[PDB]
């Protein structure tokens, strides 16, 4: 019902609309959420991150990180993503 043999506008047989910008606007490749990137720079986080401590009950392996970046949706940017060494992002 989405990959049908029609042309529609966001469909697959698209004809007539290739001339327009419609199949590249309404059918977006890797359509994701806003996605801002909170970046860890040498152990110091950029935005509203606040490093936390995991439960240390059954962790087998936990690797630490100092550089890199985490991809946070704009919805969860409102609150602190609370990055942690064991499990990355959550709501707390």
């Amino acid at each position: 019902d989405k990959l049908t043999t029609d042309i529609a506008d966001t469909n697959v047989f698209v004809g007539g609309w290739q001339l327009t910008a419609n199949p590249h606007e309404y059918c977006k490749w890797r359509r994701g959420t806003k996605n801002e990137d909170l970046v860890l720079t040498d152990g110091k986080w950029s935005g509203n991150v606040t490093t936390t401590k995991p439960i240390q009950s059954k962790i087998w392996r936990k690797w630490q990180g100092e550089n890199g970046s985490i991809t946070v949706p704009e919805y969860l940017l409102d609150k602190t993503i609370c990055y942690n060494d064991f499990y990355g992002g959550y709501e707390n």
């Binding site: 040498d42 152990g43 630490q64 100092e66």
Partner: protein
């Protein structure tokens, strides 16, 4: 049978020390005492934590509290009063069946060894904690019911036989076995050297600007009474694989080493206490341990 415990059962502190005030004296002139003051100094460190090495750069730079002897006197004096109190087997706020069966259970305990280890921890200067580090000579003056006892450097981890420690422990055991009380005014003289940094009790703080804050009373350097009292009951040499005396605790628990020395091997206070009430025979060292926890105090409820 099987009297379990009162859930409310608690015992009070039978060994009450005062806050150990610190003064600066000379080794020859011990009467001219001057208040060692807790000042604050600022400090530039190197930010050396175990984890991330990439913040080893830039300063650590924070303020802490310090207490040094002034550079005209070379001896640290520590003043406190330790009050041993009797009625040790009565529960202050616990029940009246379990408490009296525990009283009859520990009525034949060896109070002499208990009192000797307490008076030895007082007289060997174990109430001094890091202030003994680099001391030429530790002279302990214990005045008890108008009787002055002077002690030189005694070996602390072993409770070797001394006749003056046994002399004070005679009235301390007479107090602890029955009713009444006794007071020990204890003055420590350690030749720390002119200007040596002393170590008063540190404080627990959360939002303070000081990274380390020392305990003070009107600015004078002082030790916590709970720290001194913890060093009174560092007599436990009766746990499993005993090497050094640890503090008397219901679980033999030392916070610093992070391992409880009497938990998990059925040598804690509560199992022996329930056994002593329920009528199985206790050995002498664990009887002394249970009595030491009773005179330490604590809610043994649960």
């Amino acid at each position: 049978t099987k009297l379990k415990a009162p859930a409310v059962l608690a015992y009070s502190r039978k060994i009450n020390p005062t806050n150990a005030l610190m003064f600066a004296v000379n080794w020859s002139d011990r009467d001219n005492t001057t208040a060692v003051m807790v000042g604050t100094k600022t400090v530039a460190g190197t930010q050396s934590v175990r984890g991330n090495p990439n913040d080893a750069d830039k300063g650590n730079i924070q303020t802490v509290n310090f207490a040094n002897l002034p550079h005209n006197k070379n001896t640290l004096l520590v003043k406190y009063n330790v009050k041993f109190v009797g009625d040790v087997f009565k529960a202050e706020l616990g029940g009246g069946e379990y408490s009296n069966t525990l009283q009859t259970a520990l009525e034949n305990t060896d109070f002499g060894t208990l009192a000797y280890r307490y008076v030895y921890n007082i007289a060997a200067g174990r109430t001094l904690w890091r202030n003994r580090v680099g001391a030429e000579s530790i002279e302990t003056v214990i005045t008890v019911n108008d009787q002055t006892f002077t002690f030189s450097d005694l070996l602390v981890n072993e409770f070797d036989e001394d006749v003056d420690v046994a002399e004070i422990a005679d009235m301390v055991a007479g107090v602890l076995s029955g009713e009444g009380f006794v007071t020990l005014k204890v003055e420590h003289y350690m030749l720390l050297g002119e200007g040596s940094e002393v170590f008063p009790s540190q404080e627990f703080v959360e939002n303070s600007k000081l990274s380390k804050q020392l305990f003070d009373l009107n600015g004078q350097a002082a030790m916590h009474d709970q720290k001194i009292g913890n060093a009174i009951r560092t007599i436990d040499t009766w746990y499993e694989d005993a090497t050094t005396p640890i503090a008397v605790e219901p679980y033999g628990s030392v916070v610093r080493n992070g391992v409880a020395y009497r938990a998990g091997n059925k040598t804690d206070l509560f199992t022996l206490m329930d056994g002593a009430v329920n009528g199985k025979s206790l050995t002498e060292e664990d009887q002394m341990f249970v009595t030491a926890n009773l005179i330490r105090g604590g809610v043994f409820g649960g």
